């Protein structure tokens, strides 16, 4: 890093990561940072052996990059290449040939250098470029006449008789291949008999290929561009050939016509324009260009079935026991829960690309986890400096003053948030929940239950999904049997509050929740936590406990519903999601009405009991 003329942060490097993973193998992450590095929990156990192997690889690279940097005389560069091949590669039967070729080219370069007795120092880049050029110059022709069909380029002075001679890539500007003189070549300025130029070489290779064809000659070129359907022209040699063929010969029955019309008719008879796509039906017709590939025959016959709708009704039976975490994860996103749980389909890449540079800002889950940990540390009045040093040892925070500013702002916000949580916090204990609703047993754990009620704090903006989760927890708590009030604090002064409810009413509502889960497991529920939430908030009157049917109220509700669905430029919106896009490409007022009905049915008690 210092050699690259960049500030040495001492983190986000291979050495740093290796030390981190080895400290993780040695020490648990819960202990803390040893010499300002946080151990990595994942690299532990037998699998941790892999880490060692990885280190060995780096141990080799750092060794060679130091040695290759210095410039040495030509004589010293001889043992290097070979020593570099055995150290990095385990050669197999097929690899030894390429390794021998590399060693031979390297030896030849250094021998040609030593032949002139060059004693000055030579950098590595020179030999590297020389090797890269000589590797490109060399070509392989060992299977020219092996017995299969020969496919190669036009080589000068090589003319062999063949029964069928085909030519491809004869477009204008591609052939003849052009090579320009250096510009200071005295021979190029004054031509003389016996001089050789690549242009004349190719112009004579074309005649050699013309006269070498014993039985059949084939010529092909690109006449039309595949992208723009624009006309392209062939090479000048093919043009002269077709012009001579047209002028020399005439088609039968064209004697009456003049020379130009006969020439045009003859040139039109030999040019065959093929289709643009292989599945074109014109190819599969009796004629000269009938294809032998029956692979595209079904596509050409246009005999196929259109893609049916992905969603289909599925028979589902509720098990006797259902965990509480299952219900929470389902009610988190039912539309997604249908694909993720019932079909076990996860639209994610198996491997995620590593970020190219160190993090300069924190967004998404990386910021949310840090905010949650800071809030949990501030609610219990724990030292924030220790958590800051822990995050610094982890390396998530930005370097220098930027990380300090981020941490200061987050600490201010989380302190403002936790000031409310500290006031209404009492010591409690987690109690096991075992319940039976409509023949289904639910088992779970509720953390930090206090005699006052249920207290939860999350560093996120106010949303109806948090309200649904808190309502599920409150129903479980009341049905288990207890007197308490549910309170959930969120970011920017948001609060979800539920009063104590009777056991029978709690069972009644949890029965509806379980029925909703059962319906969602069969077919994808059309329940939107946020859009339907805004629709209900606009329609439902808190004072009168009734749903307003005024036309202006309905218009405002539809406006807010579409706003929460599509979203602004800044907020993607609830409608934008892979799972929602998989259901329908575009919105339908029938789908809209069904979503409104189901979301109202499932979310009405949330706004009814909210205080």
């Amino acid at each position: 890093v210092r050699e690259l003329e960049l500030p040495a942060t001492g983190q986000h490097t291979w050495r740093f990561g290796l030390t981190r993973m080895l400290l993780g193998y040695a020490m648990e992450s819960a202990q803390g940072e040893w010499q300002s590095v946080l151990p990595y929990d994942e690299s532990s156990g037998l699998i941790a052996e892999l880490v060692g192997h990885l280190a060995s690889l780096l141990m080799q690279l750092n060794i060679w990059r130091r040695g290759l940097a210095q410039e040495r005389p030509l004589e010293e560069w001889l043992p290097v290449c070979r020593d570099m091949l055995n150290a990095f590669f385990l050669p197999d039967a097929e690899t030894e040939a390429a390794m021998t070729l590399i060693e031979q080219q390297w030896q030849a370069i250094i021998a040609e250098g030593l032949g002139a007795q060059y004693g000055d120092a030579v950098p590595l880049s020179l030999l590297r470029d020389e090797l890269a050029q000589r590797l490109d110059q060399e070509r392989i022709s060992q299977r020219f006449l092996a017995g299969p069909v020969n496919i190669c380029t036009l080589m000068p002075m090589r003319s062999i008789p063949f029964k069928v001679v085909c030519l491809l890539g004869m477009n204008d500007g591609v052939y003849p291949r052009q090579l320009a003189p250096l510009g200071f070549d005295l021979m190029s300025q004054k031509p003389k008999r016996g001089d050789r130029s690549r242009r004349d070489d190719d112009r004579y290779l074309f005649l050699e290929a013309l006269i070498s064809a014993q039985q059949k000659l084939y010529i092909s070129y690109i006449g039309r561009s595949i992208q723009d359907n624009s006309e392209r022209f062939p090479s000048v040699l093919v043009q002269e050939l077709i012009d001579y063929i047209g002028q020399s010969h005439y088609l039968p029955g064209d004697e009456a016509l003049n020379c130009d019309e006969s020439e045009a008719r003859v040139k039109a008879h030999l040019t065959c324009l093929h289709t643009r796509m292989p599945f074109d039906p014109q190819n599969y017709q009796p004629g000269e260009r009938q294809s032998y590939a029956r692979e595209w025959l079904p596509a050409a016959s246009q005999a196929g079935k259109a893609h049916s709708e992905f969603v289909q009704p599925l028979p589902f039976t509720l098990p006797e026991t259902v965990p509480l975490e299952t219900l929470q994860r389902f009610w988190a996103h039912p539309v997604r829960a249908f694909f993720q749980m019932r079909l076990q389909v996860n639209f994610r890449t198996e491997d995620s690309e590593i970020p190219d540079t160190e993090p300069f800002i924190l967004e998404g889950l990386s910021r949310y986890q840090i905010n949650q940990q800071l809030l949990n540390a501030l609610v219990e009045q724990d030292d924030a400096e220790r958590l800051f040093r822990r995050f610094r040892a982890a390396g998530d925070l930005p370097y220098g003053a930027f990380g300090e500013i981020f941490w200061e702002t987050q600490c201010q916000e989380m302190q403002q948030l936790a000031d409310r949580v500290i006031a209404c916090r009492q010591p409690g204990q987690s109690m096991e929940i075992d319940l039976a609703c409509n023949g289904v047993q639910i088992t779970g754990w509720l953390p930090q239950v206090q005699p006052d009620g249920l207290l939860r704090w999350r560093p996120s903006l106010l949303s109806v999904a948090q309200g649904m989760q808190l309502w599920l927890e409150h129903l479980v708590y009341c049905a288990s049997g207890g007197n308490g009030e549910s309170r959930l604090f969120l970011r920017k002064d948001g609060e979800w509050r539920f009063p104590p409810l009777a056991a029978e009413q709690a069972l009644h509502y949890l029965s509806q929740l379980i029925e909703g889960y059962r319906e969602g497991m069969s077919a994808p529920l059309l329940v939107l936590p946020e859009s339907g939430g805004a629709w209900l908030k606009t329609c439902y009157d808190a004072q009168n406990d009734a749903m307003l049917d005024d036309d202006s109220t309905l218009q405002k509700a539809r406006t807010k519903f579409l706003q929460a669905y599509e979203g602004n430029m800044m907020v993607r919106g609830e409608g934008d999601d892979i799972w929602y896009q998989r259901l329908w490409r575009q919105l339908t007022p029938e789908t809209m009405e069904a979503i409104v009905e189901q979301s109202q049915r499932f979310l009405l008690p949330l706004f009814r009991f909210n205080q």
């Binding site: 960049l6 500030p7 004589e75 001889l78 290449c81 070979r82 020593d83 039967a93 097929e94 030894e96 040939a97 021998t100 060693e103 031979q104 030896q107 250094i110 050029q133 392989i140 060992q142 299977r143 092996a146 595949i226 992208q227 359907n229 643009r276 796509m277 599945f279 039906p281 599969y284 009938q290 294809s291 032998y292 590939a293 025959l297 596509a299 016959s301 246009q302 005999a303 196929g304 079935k305 259109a306 893609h307 709708e309 992905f310 969603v311 289909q312 599925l314 694909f339 079909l343 076990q344 890449t349 198996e350 690309e353 540079t357 300069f360 220098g400 003053a401 930027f402 300090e404 500013i405």
Partner: protein
Amino acid sequence: EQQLIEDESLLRYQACADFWRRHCYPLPREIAQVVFETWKGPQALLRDINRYLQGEAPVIKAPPPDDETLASRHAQIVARIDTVKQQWRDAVGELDALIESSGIDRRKFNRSNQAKWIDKISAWAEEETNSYQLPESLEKFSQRFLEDRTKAGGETPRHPLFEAIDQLLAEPLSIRDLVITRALAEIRETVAREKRRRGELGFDDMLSRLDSALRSESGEVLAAAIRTRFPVAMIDEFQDTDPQQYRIFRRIWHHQPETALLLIGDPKQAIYAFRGADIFTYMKARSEVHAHYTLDTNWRSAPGMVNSVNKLFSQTDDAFMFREIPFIPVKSAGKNQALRFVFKGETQPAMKMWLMEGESCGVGDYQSTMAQVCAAQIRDWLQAGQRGEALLMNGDDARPVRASDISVLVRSRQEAAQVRDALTLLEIPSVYLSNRDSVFETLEAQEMLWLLQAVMTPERENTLRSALATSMMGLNALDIETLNNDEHAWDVVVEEFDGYRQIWRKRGVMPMLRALMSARNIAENLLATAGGERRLTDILHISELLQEAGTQLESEHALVRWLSQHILEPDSNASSQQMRLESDKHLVQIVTIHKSKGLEYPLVWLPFITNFRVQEQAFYHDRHSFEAVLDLNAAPESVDLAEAERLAEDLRLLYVALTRSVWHCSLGVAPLVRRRGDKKGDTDVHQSALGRLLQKGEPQDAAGLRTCIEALCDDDIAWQTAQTGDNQPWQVNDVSTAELNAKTLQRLPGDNWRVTSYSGLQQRGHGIAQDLMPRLDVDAAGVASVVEEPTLTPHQFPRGASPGTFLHSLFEDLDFTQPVDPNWVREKLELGGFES
């Protein structure tokens, strides 16, 4: 000897990150606060200067001094704020008394409101000056504000502190311009240094190097040699030129004897400003040359079509709002005098404009209504063509109006989609043509990436089940549930994907995709599905590109990484990534205005020609100097010139779109308002290119627009109100399909004849090792551990193919009769690379 690179975006981002690391890291917290307030990260900073990094560097108005640093600017701003605060702290008592004494209407300036402001300013003054942010009440306490609210004929309050606030609030305080200039310079230098170190070149770099060489002292001999190389130079498409290109062309051919410089162009058709082409360069070139020639004959369109355009562009003195771009009326060809379009037995005018009803109209409603009307009119044209009532007539000859004749021109890709949907509602097939698109943006690229990730690892259930659920495969949820319930079918599918991976490893990428599509009938079901032809063409193009890329890659996983990298960030300027034509059939063509340049169409439809867009960035060209000027302060005086250039570009685009029509051109016009403040307020049609020509650059209302349209109308130009057409689909008679059968091979070609060697005949494991080295010692293979040698005995000599080849080469050239020479063996060992 040098190499060429197509894309430099990664180099730009790396240089920006390096500049950020170098500059922002050593900054103290007090300055880092402002730096973070201005930009969140290096990518946000690159997002601002990415436009200026490409191409020639633009001149910056009022450049900061080179010696100035960020800390010095911070200290200067802090000193200014401190002076203002110190003046306020002393003047916190006389202002109250002075305000009462001053004769200013208190209705504007409420005592209670004044008390709130006084307290807010006092609180701000007391606080330490950590940041540049200032209170709103300082604006209310400015001398100019007081002079505005003060009643006439009375004493005006005047204190030194009030004067200081006006001077301060006159210009915003920030550090953006200095950092922007330093970042531009540093990133340009770093990218140039990196490309010089690697030795690679770029298309812009070639022009830059040629210009810098010509401007240098060695430029004279270079220009002389180039001029001796080419005596006459003809530059086509001169309207789209850059300053560097014109500088080069002038350097070589200005005032040179026995040389010719023919610059052929059209100023009215300069619509490539986004690529970097400068019209002001053409304007500067026009003044320097004193010979101007024009072509006064139009050979493409009908006489009425030419007359309509000539009348439309002759309303104002300066149609193109520029004095250097005059409009000269052109004639019509004598052969084209007989051309006419006849609909239902009645001749139609050359230019027809559709006007939408209403006093004011939104953008979206206007676009929807015009798309519907255009679809209805195209359907009516197609039906009249099939019945034969509508014809295109040259002299006595008449031909029916087919689907290939009609064409619709749109400015953006999103619009094009709306017109395509509007045509699809009427069951009219259409094909979209564009110049700026990438196949990696399509969903097919993501689905192909998922399929490749699944094939690479078929053992993992999650990835394979995710790839099976893709829309490309064509499997519903019922099949997925059936496959999840049964382990046997799942194992069969896993074995199938393992065979696909074997085919990928052995034959290649596309040979695997071919078998995958053939086994599951992907192409058949895609062509059966509506709109699947575009998806199939995209899949085939992506397969070809994947084959080309995997040809030049080390491993198979490298191809998946390359595809993912191309998917994450796609390039639209690349010609290879451009989307191919959807279909070769004769259909209704939707082509962008930029691509339609240089082409002719019989019937042209412009549904959204009225819609316009205002630009906010303050980047313009000096009218006198003809040089590109960027204003970092973003003063309104520069935004006005930028808006003027934008309007001129819109006028040029309108001319290019209008000139395309051979027989008939239809335009959709309507009173368009961005934001309606008041109903009596004028419409924003004047800002549009067509509206400026219709209203002569004068803002008016919907009635005024309709009256101007009525006044403009003549035999050539007619107008009709736009109403939604009957939503009836275009009925096309069915066509019979003949039976299609592919040929079969009665004889199978035999691979019996071959040239073989003993090693290939016996040893199969060697593979292509014999091809690489013809004389390789293939007898010995499978090297073992030769780490250490205790006594360096011949048995401990390194074993393998290369040591065996070395041993053979030793005996090849050795002289048997003479005794062995130690120096010769030492030299052979040194050349081979072994230890001494």
